[PDB]
Design a protein around this ligand. Structure first.
Ligand SMILES: Nc1ncnc2c1ncn2[C@@H]1O[C@H](COP(=O)(O)OP(=O)(O)NP(=O)(O)O)[C@@H](O)[C@H]1O
Ligand SMILES: Nc1ncnc2c1ncn2[C@@H]1O[C@H](COP(=O)(O)OP(=O)(O)NP(=O)(O)O)[C@@H](O)[C@H]1O
Ligand SMILES: Nc1ncnc2c1ncn2[C@@H]1O[C@H](COP(=O)(O)OP(=O)(O)NP(=O)(O)O)[C@@H](O)[C@H]1O
Ligand SMILES: Nc1ncnc2c1ncn2[C@@H]1O[C@H](COP(=O)(O)OP(=O)(O)NP(=O)(O)O)[C@@H](O)[C@H]1O
Ligand SMILES: Nc1ncnc2c1ncn2[C@@H]1O[C@H](COP(=O)(O)OP(=O)(O)NP(=O)(O)O)[C@@H](O)[C@H]1O
Ligand SMILES: Nc1ncnc2c1ncn2[C@@H]1O[C@H](COP(=O)(O)OP(=O)(O)NP(=O)(O)O)[C@@H](O)[C@H]1O
Ligand SMILES: [Cl-]
Ligand SMILES: [Cl-]
Ligand SMILES: [Cl-]
Ligand SMILES: [Cl-]
Ligand SMILES: [Cl-]
Ligand SMILES: [Cl-]
Ligand SMILES: [Mg+2]
Ligand SMILES: [Mg+2]
Ligand SMILES: [Mg+2]
Ligand SMILES: [Mg+2]
Ligand SMILES: [Mg+2]
Ligand SMILES: [Mg+2]
Lengths: 223, 224, 216, 220, 219, 222
């Protein structure tokens, strides 16, 4: 039974049946405001507080200052974790992504990070305007992350709740695990739901499970 | 956590739970005739009248005169406010947008502006056929305004009521906040609803809430 | 309150609440055979008969001879109105076209204008040229009705998904098929700076042109 | 606006006189809806009923095939040809060449009625300018003053009127032929969507293809 | 009164009302596994075993080895019919060149029937499909042989073929469906169109058995 | 009749009425996480442990280590079979497929292999921007047919009731077509397998429920 690392996110370990596979890549996809960024922070936060596992958060759009400010919403002082050397926020914003895939390796080995979060991968391709080389590029990242033995959570974007899993119809096949966050609207009201669509070489709960965002972060309800 | 300024739009400060996050940009998407322009004016107007916060209105298609004429409808004397140096209308009528971002930055400092609104970003990218660089250039704009520390309202256009949030399916991800105006047709009648889809770092009411455009602007109805 | 000119089309002036905003462009979009041309004609016709306001008609496919033949169907004598210099039909069957229109508006002193249809010019960069025309017509200060085509009754407003945002006002004409039967409805989607009735309202085409039925 | 009687049972009722004279009419429809049969009858009825000569223009099917297929309804097209009342123009990037060739036949035969089947096929034989070229034909035919029936093809029954979403706007009139499937069964319906400068009945009307051709039931 | 050629497929000659029109092209479109190949094999097989009519089968993907093996599932020795000269499988695994090879085969074997499975496989050459399909169909008509061309489609109630052009280039059109509803499949055949002649309309239930295709007429 | 080799995957040989046709290619199409890879492993694993039949696995995305690591959860010692020379994982990780067609032909002949799994044929054309698929795939199908190998090729999907594969050509190139579904209704998923087509042989029609237990795929014939 492939080894998993407990995420400690209320409910997720029940749905995943132990947490996220170690050294494997997990895609957390969702429409805007589904809780993709939040999930990836709480994945790094819980690893530091509950198992003293150093974390790397790579951001292509939001700035370290903003990721911190927005985290203070949930009573998390990411400012302190940065000083203590437990967390590292890599800013990869714009002024073959082998230039960046090496910059992350340098931080992982430097900080000795077990957990990694990339948010959001899609933007790199949407910034470079190169929707051709996506399956090849996303694979070079996942593969180079698999060689360092690091448990990774990458977020992607989508336009619909029951349409393609991601934006290019390929990211689901380059990742080991696939988690889908939905914010479905029916009758003028929204319903947040989480779903582990796939986990390679391990069991998990199927279908969508309700969750809500509170002052303590994500809280999923196993049924 | 993140502070927010009151828009003073009847009902909106209840949905948003205090107003719009300060120094962050908010996207207001919608089909044609949903109230995007009204929203961006009422934002700037209220900020000047109730708080003395100066503001800058960026227009791409509509002319300054048209904006002043259309606003007189609600008893808002925008012309007066331009003379006082309280409101400034930047005309951006007719691939990079750095020249634009610098002109907005100049007005902001020249008028000591607190609030800003662009209406509408989409049209700029369509008037130059530069559609493969929207996420790049929109981010450059939203990133600059963040440094200047201005609360910005950007309006975007959509073609469907329950389809993509914006035109190119990217604008939603670059903005900190996302408001969605709707004008749904069902049974040969129209229903106007507003939804705050996302507010980064803060809480807000979820789902779409009804509103109407009265003789005194937008009026939203919270349900709890 | 923005001033409006009465179209004199039965029902429409109730829905629009006085008529079309003066000096602005109004998009009239519809599928094939919805009454786009008819609306454009009736607009100019009623302007001449009811207020002696001269009119200009820009045609991009139908010839002036067919526009007059098709108008005779409703008992209108466009040939007479032309011969009096009260109506001008510019046969165009985008900067060079504006020069043709501006010369005609000034020559005839035309307060109303109809363009049928804008879309065809492109199918024969749409936001740029559409905005060029609409911006120019505004500077001249003429009230315009531009017709536009569509394929679906409840799909895009126009054909490119841009025309709706370039026009100050939008009117959608529908001819919906339900249970092998056709229902004609008109709707004012948007009017910048002024109020109007929302939703679709039933209408018919008779021997006196379009007749809309405002509900309340 | 004057109308000529098509003599197709029911059509002159739905159209309220027939087809606007000197105008072009589009007959759009999916495969096997009866676009060809409609265009043959328009000509045939004109020849036998009013001695109005007819010009049929075919891009795909051969003049021998169009005759062999009509003999199934008891129509002798070979006779109308030998008489010099019907002409079958075999037309198996501009359409100006075709327009001139078509005008030769109209003038030669002193034809009043014309039918083209089908204009879609010429544009795929790859000029997907169709509006510009389809307007060149319609404008010239309107200059000649010949009442024309041009068939067009479509893929969906309740989708676009034609194939390129343009043809319908260039034509003076539009007739949609449908062959809708439901419960594993097919129902044939005809509808006049548009008749410029004149009145007509709205909605779809049932019809069948008998051994005597098209027959439409006008409910009203 | 266009004369028909009996296909000898149980039920089809009732739906078609005599069979397929002689010297015409019949389009048999259908999604994957609807019986397209099987139909075209029975057309030749039945023609040879009953009317002594030599057949020319054209294949662009399938090998003449696999076609003979597949037919042998229904007790059809296409090998023996090949030896006698009554059948001739033309392998076209890699367009006026093919028409010369086909007209050669039809004339060289004094053949009445023809099958082409499938015309979709031939065509990035999509901008000349109508033109090239019309070149073939026109060449086949002038030759004077009854042809059966199969075509592919994606949806059961979507386009009749794969390009929205083959349906009009052909004289006759048969649509084979394999509709899925409630986790079960439902095979039906439909003659959408037959030029110059009458046929039965709508879908008709059919099954594939040890004796080939079996259609159920409701009339 | 067309000869078939038993897959030994519970229920499959009932639906297929004997197994997969010998020397013919079979397409296994499905959305992400439907069980395509798992199906392609169990195929080769069952052939070896039951019939001592050597198999080759052509992997594009997953590494040889992961395919083995993932199989451990079902108690399948894939590492042992690589050492015993009964299984070979061809690492095809990084428009012509000729180099691959010869590498595969080498492994087939060099290991006396009769079963072949290719996971997944769609990824190659995405990784090389070759979206010449009907052209290239036909070369692969034709080659494998000549060599005399029973092949399982998995294709990707986006919709459960839409196109069978990604390009709408792969279904017509293959001799046989299996479809895996993971349909969502009422917030709950449901796994079903379907044999869409089998050239020259009979099979059970429609969708059949299945699950993925501690011993692989289990299908329930109805
Ligand atoms: N004085 C008024 N009283 C009531 N309703 C009004 C008044 N003025 C405008 N409206 C309505 O409110 C709408 C305002 O449109 P606007 O604020 O320009 O929306 P928009 O989304 O910016 N349109 P567009 O720019 O075409 O996308 C109009 O369509 C009118 O129906
Ligand atoms: N303190 C809080 N309490 C409850 N909900 C909150 C709180 N803070 C943020 N949220 C919600 O969480 C959302 C932001 O979560 P986030 O993880 O940024 O989503 P996302 O999918 O990353 N959005 P985007 O980056 O635009 O794709 C907002 O839309 C809020 O509704
Ligand atoms: N003699 C006849 N008696 C009864 N029905 C017939 C007869 N001839 C043809 N039909 C039917 O009527 C249809 C007429 O076909 P046709 O007029 O060619 O339609 P179409 O729309 O032109 N086909 P296409 O050219 O493929 O677009 C045929 O498909 C037959 O089903
Ligand atoms: N005298 C009349 N009485 C009743 N109805 C009429 C009369 N004349 C025209 N119509 C109707 O009006 C329609 C044509 O109106 P028209 O104004 O040409 O529409 P349109 O949208 O411009 N067509 P198109 O130019 O192809 O997009 C026809 O479908 C007729 O049913
Ligand atoms: N002996 C048999 N008994 C019953 N059914 C059979 C038999 N042989 C084949 N079949 C079925 O018939 C189908 C084969 O028909 P075929 O003509 O190959 O379909 P097709 O439409 O040509 N497929 P494709 O070539 O991929 O487009 C298979 O899906 C089998 O289920
Ligand atoms: N050991 C196990 N026990 C029970 N279930 C499992 C086990 N391992 C995997 N699964 C489930 O079975 C599924 C099969 O995965 P897999 O065969 O990789 O699907 P796939 O369609 O190949 N995915 P992709 O490669 O992304 O297209 C996994 O997603 C798990 O949900
Ligand atoms: Cl919530
Ligand atoms: Cl309102
Ligand atoms: Cl009416
Ligand atoms: Cl009938
Ligand atoms: Cl069956
Ligand atoms: Cl399961
Ligand atoms: Mg985010
Ligand atoms: Mg506006
Ligand atoms: Mg018109
Ligand atoms: Mg025809
Ligand atoms: Mg086949
Ligand atoms: Mg896989």
């Amino acid at each position: 039974a492939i080894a998993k690392m407990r995420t400690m996110i209320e409910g997720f370990d029940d749905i995943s049946h132990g947490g996220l596979p170690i050294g494997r890549s997990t895609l957390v996809s969702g429409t805007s405001g589904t809780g993709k960024t939040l999930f990836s922070i709480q994945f790094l936060y819980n690893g530091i507080i509950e198992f003293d596992e150093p974390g790397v958060f790579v951001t292509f759009e939001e700035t370290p200052q903003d990721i911190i400010k927005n985290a203070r919403s949930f009573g998390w002082d990411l400012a302190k974790l940065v000083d203590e050397g437990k967390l590292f926020i890599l800013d990869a914003s714009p002024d073959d992504l082998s230039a960046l895939i090496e910059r992350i390796n340098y931080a992982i080995q430097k900080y000795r990070a077990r957990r990694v979060s990339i948010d959001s991968v899609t933007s790199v391709f949407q910034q470079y305007d190169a929707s051709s080389v996506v399956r090849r590029e996303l694979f070079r990242l996942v593969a180079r992350l698999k060689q360092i033995g690091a448990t990774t959570v990458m977020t992607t974007e989508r336009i619909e709740e029951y349409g393609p899993i991601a934006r290019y119809g390929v990211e689901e096949f380059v990742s080991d695990n696939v988690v889908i966050l939905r914010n479905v609207l029916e009758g003028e009201r929204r319903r947040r739901t989480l779903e582990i669509l796939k986990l390679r070489g391990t069991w998990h709960m199927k279908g969508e499970y309700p969750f809500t965002i509170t002052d303590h972060g994500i809280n999923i309800f196993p049924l």
